[PDB]
């Protein structure tokens, strides 16, 4: 029972980051958390079981885990410890993750590009790009 989401499954390691501190500033992350989070080189583990997608991040800073069904809102605790309401959908092969909290919104898009999993994080006008490779 293969699914298009299968392109994302596996274990991935962070290899590059751009503009992440500015993105975190826009989200409202405090100085100390930005410094320590920005140093992290997470592994991201993506798995699928039936309709349930699991994305785990493991790092020296924090471990995070979400499980979800596409299009079905859920409660998430982010790496910076926001309590958010999240909805993840697939739009043309791109995983689109919207997080809402305190009247704010940010969108995280995840796409396969060559042998990379590219993660684009947008808050207001500020974009950060984080590139992962297979571990």
Ligand X SMILES: O=C(O)[C@H]1CCN(c2ccccc2)[C@H]1COc1ccccc1
In the annotated binding site for a fatty acid, the residues are 130-132
Distance, in Å, from the CA atom of 51 to the CA atom of 1, rounded to the nearest integer, reads 11
**Closest distance between ligand X and the C-beta of residue 55, in Å?**
8
Distance, in Å, from the CA atom of 2 to the CA atom of 101, rounded to the nearest integer, reads 34
Which of 84, 90 has the CB closer to ligand X?
84
Residues between 102 and 121 that touch ligand X (CB under 6 A): 108, 119, 121
Distance, in Å, from the CA atom of 107 to the CA atom of 109, rounded to the nearest integer, reads 6
Distance, in Å, from the CA atom of 88 to the CA atom of 71, rounded to the nearest integer, reads 6
Residues between 14 and 53 that touch ligand X (CB under 6 A): 24, 27, 29, 37, 40, 42
Residues between 53 and 82 that touch ligand X (CB under 6 A): 57, 59, 61-62, 64, 78-80
For the residues of 70-107, what is the DSSP string, one character each? TT--EEEE-TT--EEEEEEEEETTEEEEEEEETTEEEE
Q: Is 123 one of the binding residues for ligand X (CB under 6 A)?
A: no
Residues at the site binding ligand X, with contacts judged by CB under 6 A: 24, 27, 29, 37, 40, 42, 57, 59, 61-62, 64, 78-80, 108, 119, 121, 130
């Amino acid at each position: 029972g293969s699914h298009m989401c299968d392109a994302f499954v596996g274990t991935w390691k962070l290899v590059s980051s751009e503009n992440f501190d500015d993105y975190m500033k826009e989200v409202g992350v405090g100085f100390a958390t930005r410094k320590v989070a920005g140093m992290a080189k997470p592994n991201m583990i993506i798995s699928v079981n039936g309709d349930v997608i699991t994305i785990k991040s493991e790092s020296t800073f924090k471990n995070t885990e979400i499980s979800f069904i596409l299009g079905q809102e859920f409660d998430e605790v982010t790496a910076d410890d926001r309590k958010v309401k999240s909805t993840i959908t697939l739009d043309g092969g791109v995983l689109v993750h919207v997080q809402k909290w305190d009247g704010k919104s940010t969108t995280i898009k995840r796409k396969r590009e060559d042998d990379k999993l590219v993660v684009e994080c947008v808050m207001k006008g500020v974009t950060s790009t984080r590139v992962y490779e297979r571990a």
